[PDB]
DNA sequence: AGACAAAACGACGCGTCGTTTTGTCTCGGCTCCCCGACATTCTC
């Protein structure tokens, strides 16, 4: 049976039927974590 | 099996669109300039 999950999955590619395949980031591939500052002074965080 | 990626849980919790309702400084004395309108007389 097809079980469904709610989350963030991205397309594998943009050609042919690749635009219909949704995958999850591999183990140990979240390598960069950006720390920003606004002119006031608060820190903002993001993971690219 | 390991350890990363992220979904799931929590009560909690604060933000958010769409509209309605609410709140908003107050009175006293005078003086002296100007103008407007409406009545009378007088000149043209």
Annotated resolution, angstroms: 2.8
- Within 8 A by CB and 6+ apart from A48, the residues are A32, A34
SS3 of A46, please?
Answer: strand
CA–C1' nearest nucleotide, residue A31: B4
How is A2-43 classified by DSSP, letter by letter?
Answer: -----S--EES-SSTTGGG-EE-PPTT----EEEEE-SS--E
Given a contact cutoff of 8 angstroms between Cβ atoms, the answer to whether A12 and A18 are in contact is yes
The approach used to solve this structure was cryo-EM
- Distance separating alpha carbons of residues A47 and A35, to the nearest angstrom: 9
Question: Is the CB of residue A34 less than 8 Å from the CB of residue A48?
Answer: yes
Nearest nucleotide, CA A4 to C1': B7
The CA–C1' separation of A44 and B22, in angstroms, is 39
In angstroms, rounded to a whole number, what is the distance separating the alpha carbons of residues A4 and A32? Answer: 30
Residues with Cβ within 8 Å of residue A30, at least 6 apart in sequence: A47
Beta partners for residue A10, in sequence order: A23
């Amino acid at each position: 049976v097809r079980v469904f999950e709610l989350g963030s999955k991205f397309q594998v590619g943009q050609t042919g039927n690749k635009k219909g395949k949704y995958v999850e980031a591999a183990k140990g591939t979240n390598l960069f974590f950006a720390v920003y500052e606004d002119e006031k002074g608060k820190r903002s965080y993001e993971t690219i």
